[PDB]
Amino acid sequence: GSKKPVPIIYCNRRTGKCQRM
Known part of the structure; x- marks a missing residue:
């Protein structure tokens, strides 16, 4: 793929816990 x-x-x-929003 490219981008x-x-x-x-x-x-x-x-x-210290991340995710997406």
Whole structure:
């Protein structure tokens, strides 16, 4: 592929757990 669209990242550094938003 060439480029990959990404969603928003939602990381709660605090409880060090991230996901997408």
